[PDB]
Amino acid sequence: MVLVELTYYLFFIGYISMGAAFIFFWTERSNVKDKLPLTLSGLIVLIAAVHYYYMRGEFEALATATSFDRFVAITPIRYIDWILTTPLMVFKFVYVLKADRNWGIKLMVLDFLMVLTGLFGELRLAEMELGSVDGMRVVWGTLSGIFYFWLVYELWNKRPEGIELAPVMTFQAIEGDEATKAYVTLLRFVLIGWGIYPIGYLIPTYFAGAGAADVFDWVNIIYNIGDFVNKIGFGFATYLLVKGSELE
Ligand SMILES: CCCCCCCC/C=C\CCCCCCCC(=O)OC[C@H](O)CO
Numbered sequence: 001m002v003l004v005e006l007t008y009y010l011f012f013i014g015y016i017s018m019g020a021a022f023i024f025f026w027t028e029r030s031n032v033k034d035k036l037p038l039t040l041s042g043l044i045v046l047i048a049a050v051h052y053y054y055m056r057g058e059f060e061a062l063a064t065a066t067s068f069d070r071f072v073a074i075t076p077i078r079y080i081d082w083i084l085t086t087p088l089m090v091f092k093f094v095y096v097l098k099a100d101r102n103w104g105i106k107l108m109v110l111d112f113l114m115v116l117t118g119l120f121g122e123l124r125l126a127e128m129e130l131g132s133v134d135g136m137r138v139v140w141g142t143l144s145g146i147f148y149f150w151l152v153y154e155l156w157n158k159r160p161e162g163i164e165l166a167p168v169m170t171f172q173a174i175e176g177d178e179a180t181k182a183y184v185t186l187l188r189f190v191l192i193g194w195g196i197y198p199i200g201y202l203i204p205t206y207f208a209g210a211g212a213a214d215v216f217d218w219v220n221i222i223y224n225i226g227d228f229v230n231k232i233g234f235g236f237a238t239y240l241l242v243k244g245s246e247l248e
Pocket residue numbers: 010013184185188189190192193225228229233237
């Protein structure tokens with residue numbers, strides 16, 4: 001029961017924290033002339049807050065069902081959230097950087113295909129006999145990982161000069177202008193923050209049997225913490241960076 005209660009309250013912390021972040025970002029856009037980036041940050045957490053509210057209510061509605069049933073009932077809503085918010089996050093980065101728009105469009109397409117193929121593998125769970133590993137689940141997840149690494153490759157290939165993997169992955173304070181620091185920040189969220197999701201995806205793929213009770217609530221805990229870190233953390237990291245870029 002304690003693992004169920006913890007999962008339940010993490011959904012609550014999620015929608016409260018997303019809503020508080022929305023209020024913050026939406027208020028702070030009144031103090032800037034270029035209101036688009038904070039508008040986008042606010043829309044991302046507002047969308048996530050609405051979906052977390054309903055995910056919490058659905059989780060509670062299935063407190064007497066299996067954790068597998070709780071997971072298959074809730075996760076499609078999480079993918080709808082991912083499919084709406086992650087293109088907005090990519091567009092916001094490309095916009096603030098003033099990057100090539102056609103390059104930005106390709107990044108958004110790769111992100112969309114990443115989430116969409118992942119969704120196809122999620123939909124295989126309800127058609128799975130447990131103890132078995134589903135072929136299409138592994139194929140869709142692999143293709144989703146390919147779109148993710150394709151996205152990572154494009155971001156890495158365009159990184160500012162001097163940026164190396166070890167300083168990025170070890171959270172070194174990197175020197176440069178706002179564009180360089182903003183690029184390093186995005187790389188860290190995509191390479192480290194976004195890597196939590198494929199790890200969670202591995203659990204319903206290969207560990208749904210294996211004698212373990214309640215692996216699926218652990219996957220919800222992993223995804224919930226990932227959403228909190230990736231949406232609120234990236235929103236506030238970029239807000240602080242743009243605030244410090246002012247030359248006036
Ligand atoms: C109730 C839930 C609260 C959850 C809160 C947990 C706090 C962090 C814990 C785990 C995240 C570890 C991985 C973090 C990966 C992203 C971090 C990142 O990208 O940092 C960039 C830096 O801030 C700019 O350069």
